[PDB]
Write a protein that binds this ligand. Structure first.
Ligand SMILES: [Mg+2]
Ligand SMILES: [Mg+2]
Ligand SMILES: [Mg+2]
Ligand SMILES: [Mg+2]
Ligand SMILES: [Mg+2]
Ligand SMILES: [Mg+2]
Ligand SMILES: [Mg+2]
Ligand SMILES: [Mg+2]
Ligand SMILES: [Mg+2]
Ligand SMILES: [Mg+2]
Ligand SMILES: [Mg+2]
Ligand SMILES: [Mg+2]
Ligand SMILES: [Mg+2]
Ligand SMILES: [Mg+2]
Ligand SMILES: [Mg+2]
Ligand SMILES: [Mg+2]
Ligand SMILES: [Mg+2]
Ligand SMILES: [Mg+2]
Ligand SMILES: [Mg+2]
Ligand SMILES: [Mg+2]
Ligand SMILES: [Mg+2]
Ligand SMILES: [Mg+2]
Ligand SMILES: [Mg+2]
Ligand SMILES: [Mg+2]
Ligand SMILES: [Mg+2]
Ligand SMILES: [Mg+2]
Ligand SMILES: [Mg+2]
Ligand SMILES: [Mg+2]
Ligand SMILES: [Mg+2]
Ligand SMILES: [Mg+2]
Ligand SMILES: [Mg+2]
Ligand SMILES: [Mg+2]
Ligand SMILES: [Mg+2]
Ligand SMILES: [Mg+2]
Ligand SMILES: [Mg+2]
Ligand SMILES: [Mg+2]
Ligand SMILES: [Mg+2]
Ligand SMILES: [Mg+2]
Ligand SMILES: [Mg+2]
Ligand SMILES: [Mg+2]
Ligand SMILES: [Mg+2]
Ligand SMILES: [Mg+2]
Ligand SMILES: [Mg+2]
Ligand SMILES: [Mg+2]
Ligand SMILES: [Mg+2]
Ligand SMILES: [Mg+2]
Ligand SMILES: [Mg+2]
Lengths: 150, 128, 138
RNA sequence: UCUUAAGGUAGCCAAAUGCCUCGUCAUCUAAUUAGUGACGCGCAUGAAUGAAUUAACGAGAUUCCCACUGUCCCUGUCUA
RNA sequence: GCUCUGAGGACUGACAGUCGACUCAGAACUGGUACGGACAAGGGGAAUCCGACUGUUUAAUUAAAACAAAGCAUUGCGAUGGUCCUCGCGGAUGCUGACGCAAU
RNA sequence: AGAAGUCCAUUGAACCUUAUCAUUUAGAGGAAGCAGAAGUCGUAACAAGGUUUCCGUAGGUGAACCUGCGGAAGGAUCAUUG
RNA sequence: UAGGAUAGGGGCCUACCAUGGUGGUGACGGGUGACGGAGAAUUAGGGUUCGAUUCCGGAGAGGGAGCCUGAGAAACGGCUACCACAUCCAAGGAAGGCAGCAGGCGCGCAAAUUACCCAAUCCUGACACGGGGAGGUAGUGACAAUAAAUAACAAUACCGGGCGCAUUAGUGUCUGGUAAUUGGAAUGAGUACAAUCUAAAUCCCUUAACGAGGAUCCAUUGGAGGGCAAGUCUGGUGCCAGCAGCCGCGGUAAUUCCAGCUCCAAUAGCGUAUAUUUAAGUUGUUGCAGUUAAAAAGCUCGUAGUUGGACCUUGGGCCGGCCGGCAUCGCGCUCCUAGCCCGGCAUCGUUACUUUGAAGAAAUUAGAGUGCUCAAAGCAAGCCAUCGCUCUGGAUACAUUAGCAUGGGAUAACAUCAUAGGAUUCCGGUCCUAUUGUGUUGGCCUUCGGGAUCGGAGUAAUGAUUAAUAGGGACAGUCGGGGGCAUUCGUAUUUCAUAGUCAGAGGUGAAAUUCUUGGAUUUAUGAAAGACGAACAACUGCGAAAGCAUUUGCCAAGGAUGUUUUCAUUAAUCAAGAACGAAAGUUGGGGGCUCGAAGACGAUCAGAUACCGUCCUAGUCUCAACCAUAAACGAUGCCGACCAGGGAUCGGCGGAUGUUGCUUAUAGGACUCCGCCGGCACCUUAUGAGAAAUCAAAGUCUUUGGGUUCCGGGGGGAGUAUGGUCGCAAGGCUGAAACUUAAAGGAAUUGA
């Protein structure tokens, strides 16, 4: 179940059986890689990259066409986001919630949600500290966190 | 959370007790199929599919109604080959039938095999 | 349910240590108040009787159970003790030297005698059964 | 049962408010009309006439303990 | 008391040279156990009553438990008004206006 | 060589004062619980217990208890398409 | 760090310096009626409780402290001092230490001789000779334990059941017994010549003579309602005496008391008391329970802790009768183990788990042998012609945990190849030590051997498992009375005003208090105030719970759905800690309609401090700040899986043709049908579960084990006292004991 609610959804994306790409995917891995780096230096995260390819450029899965995940192409070309995808977006959501709350002091629901979002941030940040994808000192300061994002 | 080899055996008990012909198992394991090999060797279930397309896996066993109970002892014990002798009495229905499956450095094997190879290990479970 | 992790030995042992205290027998036996009772962890106790009293009997019955107020030579407690034979009270007399034992139910009031936990088993150094049976007169 | 407009509520007390009074009990002392703490049918206690407490503070009033001492036993002497 | 030891700095060319008024600790010895040696300079504690505190007061017999105090409450008043002075004209609050003035 | 004595250290009993801990024990008065009996005042609860019961909180009353606000059915309704 | 001291390491101590050490894995502190262990009792297994005590270790000799001698002592059957105690004194002085043996006092429920002995076991000395209250022997010893007497056998008898016929008898077989009936046999308890035993006696073992008539050579303990075995015996007592562990008996016919007979259970033993084990699956890891019987925290977050998805070759074979060795698509070894070019060789990730081995003190326990006569025991003893000696044994096991060592790598944790600073035979550059060409010691040097460093070429499949019906994040169209700020509206209630009308109005079952010809009630129009948001409105939605229903706007947030997007285990539950938490309540502003604790009245009633009716303060509302509880409920913790059926319904999505008072036509919106997920629920049935009520989750439970938190151990006393802590206060959280009690309680049945 969702880790911070009693919701129990199972909606998701079910990956196709065949790991190999379909016939009609005939654009070359180098050109796909250049598309990845073009949009990355244009400033989009791996989620936006995958969606963009899946929608306009007809690339089902970049791992299927290339053998390397979006983040791995970006890490190899040195365009990878400094702060990971999901930690970035949890920080951005915490900044939004705290900015709203600082003007709406009676918003106990927003105070609860901020407790939950910062809880998620800190749980995930411990993971990234243990897997060394973040600096061993990176600490989420609520004060000067809005500079980091947005 | 999941701690399968219980999610498999309890499914099998429920299917048998309802009299279903085939039961399917959502995760698999090398340990799981090695347990089912003990069952099939000792003639308690008949042959079965192991659907390994791409993921954790899936299995389908056909029950012959010859099984009666099968369980996992999560909280997997320590177990010497000198002192299975009071697990066999503590769990199995009698000293003639029933088998206690203990994982040992020679792979998954039942306690009568453990007497003759004289190797102990950890309880995976049992069936009788 | 229970905690059955293979590494939960600390939790289970602490939990039984903590939960044995609700058990009345364990609490009574280790709380240390048994040494604050009159006998203070003794089977019998020689004491001096103050007076032959006689006391009421409880609701369903109706009678006068003939007890005595005794003082304990060992620690000065004054208590009430029964005299368990027919008309045996006459043998007891004021300021005699008696042996007081538990009256049954292990320090808990017995039968229809209200709030009395003790019985007289000797007086003036002579067996009280022997007094009852004329085997030996004091 | 008579009667009032209402019948002294929460509290509190021989209190700086109690005549009887040196109230009764306990404590303090060898001995206490004093002090404290309780008891209240309280001559004549009592609620912003403020009631009950209240740490700190007081050239405020009262009681006791320790140190100290010519205040005293009991006076003596010295200096201006 | 005396004889020491240690630490704390400045200026000049992790060092060298020059200078430095003080403070703080520690030790050995010494004396008729005397040492804040004169001067200066809290007696302490257990409680009760009263007033919260600070403050003010009967100059020349009463310095307090009295008065004041903040705190609390009440009353009048929206300017053609409230409280008040004035013999009269006029005036104080008011260079103000209810988070204010006035009377308790 | 060598004793009494003596000096300075060191170990240090033992006593003394305060502080404090712990175990028992006294206390006028206040106020709990229990047991007893052949008591007084009520009628609170169990039926719709004669005001449905009860939970939390606040105030009151000789006593059970009463009322106010919110909640529950362990309700006296599993029910408005009649 | 340096030293001092010690026999010696060491803050053991000194001088200087640093600021460290332990802790929720429980330090420090407190209790212990606590010496530790080998072990004892009980035990199906697991456990629970105990262990002062004869074996080992430690500590003390009245309490502390300090030393001599000596190899060895902080000795106490050695000394010095103090404190407590006390002895002799001729009054100055002096001697002390039984928790050694024995013995005396006291304390107590509680514990024996002021004996003998060196003979054994050993110790000790200068020592074959001495000494030994160590130790042995003897006296008291129902501590505990063992064997085990109190009669046996015969015919007679009133008799008593078949069996020889079994009728019709009659007597018949083991003898069953009331038989002190009759009878001779057997013996040890006891007495005792003697011998043996003994260091000397004593006991035991042998045995001259003595030693049984059933009253004695006498068996008791407790019980006779239920449990629980054994009186619907007799007399006495009369809710008394008394019994009774509990239930209960006794109130003049007592199966229950006091007695006699009879009987019963155990039997030289049994009852009683306390403590403890079992019972007790009433402490539950094996192995309990939490909807209603005691028990899910109000709810969520949350660190430690506990628990953690799947994936990695031994895949197929030979070979000999459970396994050796083999080969296949086995990173190398120089060296010891190293073939008749070759098995089976070093160093270059940890643990757990598991197998085997070693070492493991005996006594205890298990257990082998053994005829102390058996038995508890003991470790002996057994067979020669039982003639100058043979054969001897005096086993073996267990010993959890910690440590050492060998084989395995299934299972489980830790650490970690993606920056390649990776692996790789080599080639020489930096610099080095030296052996055999230094026969003597050798010391720097050219190819050499080797660390270290070091650049470039080289090869290889050159190196990154999947993407969970785990989770996070993104994205799209949504949905929701989810939240906050502002904002529009609605009638109604009250008040007030303007107008009209006239005797009543309000309220009740009926009244009265109350308002009213100073015009109440009623009607219309309108304004102010504050509250509330009808109907729609539901077995419907949203929210973590509390809770959230007028409108629009804004602000952030959210579940589900969809997804061929991403991250790749990041997760589940969570002591400490943290956020929200109805109503009441508290501090202080604003507001003050309605309603309304307290309070005041009128009724009722015996009372009426209540229900009923009028007025009404706080309050109800809002703000700022507290409080932290509710039958905060589903009396049902959280995540996960399986299992049974259906129609509804909520949101999302997908697929159907078939009509819209829509749509420039279609799509889309409403509606009909079918299917997926995720919700809130409901209806039927046990094949299940349960004490049942009942429950499709309270099932998958004695065929008991997915993970995790909290929490109960009969009813009271009691959520009380005391302590702590938080709070302005109310109070909240944490929270006993004494004593008392035999039932309290849950579900269902019948009756009333
Ligand atoms: Mg799921
Ligand atoms: Mg969680
Ligand atoms: Mg018990
Ligand atoms: Mg009774
Ligand atoms: Mg009064
Ligand atoms: Mg008075
Ligand atoms: Mg005086
Ligand atoms: Mg007084
Ligand atoms: Mg008066
Ligand atoms: Mg007055
Ligand atoms: Mg007043
Ligand atoms: Mg007055
Ligand atoms: Mg003053
Ligand atoms: Mg004056
Ligand atoms: Mg003056
Ligand atoms: Mg004026
Ligand atoms: Mg009633
Ligand atoms: Mg009622
Ligand atoms: Mg009812
Ligand atoms: Mg009332
Ligand atoms: Mg009222
Ligand atoms: Mg009911
Ligand atoms: Mg040193
Ligand atoms: Mg001790
Ligand atoms: Mg010893
Ligand atoms: Mg000693
Ligand atoms: Mg000594
Ligand atoms: Mg001695
Ligand atoms: Mg002795
Ligand atoms: Mg008898
Ligand atoms: Mg009897
Ligand atoms: Mg009898
Ligand atoms: Mg019977
Ligand atoms: Mg009895
Ligand atoms: Mg009986
Ligand atoms: Mg139970
Ligand atoms: Mg309950
Ligand atoms: Mg709940
Ligand atoms: Mg954690
Ligand atoms: Mg009118
Ligand atoms: Mg709705
Ligand atoms: Mg509406
Ligand atoms: Mg509660
Ligand atoms: Mg609850
Ligand atoms: Mg739908
Ligand atoms: Mg209880
Ligand atoms: Mg019931």
């Amino acid at each position: 179940g969702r880790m911070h609610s009693r919701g129990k959804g199972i909606s998701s994306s079910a990956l196709p059986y065949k790991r190999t790409p379909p016939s009609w995917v005939k654009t070359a891995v180098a050109d796909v890689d250049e598309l990845i780096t073009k949009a990355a230096k244009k400033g989009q995260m791996p989620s936006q990259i995958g969606v963009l390819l899946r929608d306009q450029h007809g690339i089902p899965l970049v791992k299927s066409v290339t053998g390397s995940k979006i983040l791995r192409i970006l890490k190899a070309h040195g365009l990878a986001p400094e702060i990971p995808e999901d930690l970035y977006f949890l920080i951005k959501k915490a900044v939004a919630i705290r900015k709203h709350l600082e003007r709406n002091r009676k918003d106990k629901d927003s105070k609860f949600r901020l407790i939950l979002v910062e809880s998620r941030i800190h749980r995930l940040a411990r993971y990234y500290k243990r897997t060394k994808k973040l600096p061993p000192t990176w600490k989420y300061e609520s004060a000067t966190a809005s500079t980091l994002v947005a | 959370g999941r701690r399968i080899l219980n999610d498999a055996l309890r499914t099998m008990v429920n299917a048998e007790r309802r009299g279903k012909a085939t039961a399917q198992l959502q995760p698999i394991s090398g340990v799981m199929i090695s347990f089912l090999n003990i069952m099939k060797h000792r003639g308690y279930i008949k042959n079965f599919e192991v659907f390994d397309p791409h993921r954790v896996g899936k299995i389908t066993v056909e029950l012959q109604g010859r099984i009666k109970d099968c369980k996992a002892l999560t909280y997997r014990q320590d177990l010497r080959a000198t002192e299975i002798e009071k697990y066999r009495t503590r769990m199995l229905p009698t000293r003639q039938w029933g088998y206690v499956v203990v994982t040992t450095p020679n792979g998954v094997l039942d306690h009568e095999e453990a007497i003759r190879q004289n190797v102990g290990g950890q309880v995976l479970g049992y069936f009788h | 349910g229970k905690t059955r992790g293979m590494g939960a030995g600390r939790k289970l042992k602490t939990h039984r240590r903590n939960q044995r205290w609700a058990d009345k027998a364990y609490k009574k036996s280790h709380l240390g108040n048994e040494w604050k009772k009159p006998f203070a962890g003794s089977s019998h106790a020689k004491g001096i009787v103050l007076e032959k009293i006689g006391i009421e009997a409880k609701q369903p019955n109706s009678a006068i159970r003939k007890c005595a107020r005794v003082q304990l030579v060992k620690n000065g407690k004054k208590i009430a003790a029964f005299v368990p034979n027919d008309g045996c009270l006459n043998f007891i007399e004021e300021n005699d030297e008696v042996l007081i034992a538990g009256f049954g139910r292990k320090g808990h009031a017995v039968g229809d005698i209200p709030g009395v936990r003790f019985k007289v088993v000797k007086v003036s150094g002579v067996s009280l059964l022997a007094l009852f049976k004329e085997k030996k007169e004091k």
